[PDB]
Amino acid sequence: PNFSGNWKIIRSENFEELLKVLGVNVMLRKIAVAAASKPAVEIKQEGDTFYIKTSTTVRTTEINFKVGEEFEEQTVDGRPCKSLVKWESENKMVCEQKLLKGEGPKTSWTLELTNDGELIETMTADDVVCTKVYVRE
Numbered sequence: 128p129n130f131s132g133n134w135k136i137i138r139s140e141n142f143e144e145l146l147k148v149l150g151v152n153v154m155l156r157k158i159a160v161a162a163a164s165k166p167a168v169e170i171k172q173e174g175d176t177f178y179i180k181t182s183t184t185v186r187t188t189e190i191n192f193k194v195g196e197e198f199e200e201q202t203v204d205g206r207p208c209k210s211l212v213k214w215e216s217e218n219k220m221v222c223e224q225k226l227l228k229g230e231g232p233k234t235s236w237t238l239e240l241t242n243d244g245e246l247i248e249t250m251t252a253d254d255v256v257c258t259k260v261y262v263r264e
């Protein structure tokens with residue numbers, strides 16, 4: 128697969144509920160929904176090595192990983208975690224996260240290239256799923 132691109136959002140679903148499950152308080156959720164519902168995602172892929180930069184006005188992140196090798200990042204609610212990405216299938220990666228400290232909902236994210244040229248991202252907390260869809264700019 129080639130995930131590389133400057134991806135722009137065309138759909139976002141269920142972000143507020145995700146934050147609610149993660150325990151983000153109502154005022155902070157309002158702020159996040161208003162400001163972080165339209166991320167821009169830059170991906171650079173070389174084989175199974177990835178760089179992903181996600182930009183919103185309230186948080187810019189950059190991660191670097193190799194599929195199958197643990198790395199450190201943060202959950203969507205900003206808690207440090209260990210992460211491990213695997214190929215669920217040829218065109219879909221899945222990242223399982225484990226908090227460095229304390230307890231919380233089980234979190235994960237996925238990225239999937241669709242047959243139409245788009246990118247589906249999901250973020251999960253326990254059973255709740257937030258889905259974003261992107262197309263290259």
Ligand SMILES: *C/C=C(C)/C=C/C=C(C)/C=C/C1=C(C)CCCC1(C)C
Nearest residue numbers: 155158159163166181185186203204
């Ligand atoms: C695809 C979904 C994305 C990139 C979600 C991003 C979420 C944020 C940048 C959330 C930020 C915040 C909180 C979770 C708590 C309060 C402080 C914020 C607004 C920076």
Ligand code: NA
Nearest residue numbers: 128174175176
């Ligand atoms: Na590959």
Ligand code: NA
Nearest residue numbers: 193194195196
């Ligand atoms: Na490996």
